[PDB]
Amino acid sequence: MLSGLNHLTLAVSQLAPSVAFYQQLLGMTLHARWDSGAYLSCGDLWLCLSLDPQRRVTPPEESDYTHYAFSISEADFASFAARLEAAGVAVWKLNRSEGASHYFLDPDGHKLELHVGSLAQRLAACREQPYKGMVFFEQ
Amino acid sequence: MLSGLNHLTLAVSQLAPSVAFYQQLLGMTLHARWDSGAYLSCGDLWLCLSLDPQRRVTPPEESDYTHYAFSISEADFASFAARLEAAGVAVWKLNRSEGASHYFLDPDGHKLELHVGSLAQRLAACREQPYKGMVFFEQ
Ligand SMILES: C[C@@H]1O[C@@H]1P(=O)(O)O
Ligand SMILES: [K+]
Ligand SMILES: [K+]
Ligand SMILES: [Mn+2]
Ligand SMILES: [Mn+2]
Ligand code: NA
Ligand code: NA
Ligand code: NA
Ligand code: NA
Ligand code: NA
Ligand code: NA
Ligand code: NA
Ligand code: NA
Ligand code: NA
Ligand code: NA
């Protein structure tokens, strides 16, 4: 039986710039680095950066909606997003769903998000205003 | 400051087959589905499947190393992987690192993994046998 997310691994085209992005701009903890990768952590999240010379720098209009959202408190959200903006980090979408979200890109075009709010909060908002054709499942 | 992964969103080409994969073959909890998505949970992990016309069914040799790993116990690992293989779920990589891992594909070719072990256990094993060029960082 599966108990949660064990780790997220992102293919990166240049290791040093990607480590700098996740460690310095996003504040994650760098634990180890080798010739072809790095290990970082973000709370309980284990992030592996894997050097892959065939990772394409991908424009967001050419990639699908697959994306990775990190948790942040409502008190920290606005200034964190403002620093990413000041650092020239590109935004790939405007927030259109409940709970503050900032949708931004990593150096290789991986689609990322800062989000304030839980699954329980999202389901509660959906129960008041269901999405199109939505069906609810219980205990 | 980021506190962990908030949610993982996967673009899918056919919603019902993808829900069946994550709910029935991987055992995750289905909370809600709608015309263009579904919300599931796996322990603390909030998984969103997003119906996206841009998603193509992608052979593993046409995608990079980016992949998503779920936690499983030592005791459950072998039979869980065997059930996936018996369900026709393809394997995309042989395990070559510390701790049991099974590398498998979802219906659209998203690269997935079952893994037994934590970041702390990986770091300890890496100190004993360092990867090429591996360096570690204190605290
Ligand atoms: C929560 C799932 O990623 C979608 P959203 O970011 O559009 O809300
Ligand atoms: K949102
Ligand atoms: K492994
Ligand atoms: Mn999202
Ligand atoms: Mn992995
Ligand atoms: Na971790
Ligand atoms: Na993608
Ligand atoms: Na950018
Ligand atoms: Na960048
Ligand atoms: Na989390
Ligand atoms: Na589960
Ligand atoms: Na959408
Ligand atoms: Na690869
Ligand atoms: Na993939
Ligand atoms: Na993917």
Numbering used by the authors:
A (entry chain B), B (entry chain A): 1 to 139
Show sentences the authors wrote.
The crystal structure of the dimeric FosAKP was determined via X-ray crystallography at 1.48 Å resolution. The three-dimensional structure of FosAKP is folded into a dimer, providing an active site per monomer. Both subunits are composed of two tandem βαβββ motifs that follow a 3D-domain swapping during homodimer formation. Consequently, each active site was formed by residues originating from both subunits. A Fos molecule was found bound in the actives site of the first molecule of the dimer. In the active site of the second molecule, a tartrate molecule was bound, which originated from the crystallization buffer. Important residues that play crucial role in Fos binding include Ser97, Lys93, His67, Tyr65, Arg122, Glu113, and Tyr103. Mn2+ binding was coordinated by two His residues (His7 and His67) and Glu113. However, two additional residues (Tyr131 from molecule A and Tyr39 from molecule B of the dimer) appeared to contribute significantly to Tar binding. In particular, the C-terminal part of the Tar-bound subunit appears to be less solvent accessible, suggesting the formation of a more compact complex.
